[PDB]
Amino acid sequence: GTTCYCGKTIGIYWFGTKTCPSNRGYTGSCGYFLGICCYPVD
Numbered sequence: 001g002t003t004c005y006c007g008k009t010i011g012i013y014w015f016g017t018k019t020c021p022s023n024r025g026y027t028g029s030c031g032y033f034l035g036i037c038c039y040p041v042d
Contacts, residue, residue: 010040015035016035027039
């Protein structure tokens, strides 16, 4: 697992995708380097 940060809200980083997986309980997201950031962190 690898961290991400957006708007001073930390999250989990998802590689090789551009949307967040819906069943994982994410409340928000932002596009990130090589992929996407999904938050809160796991």
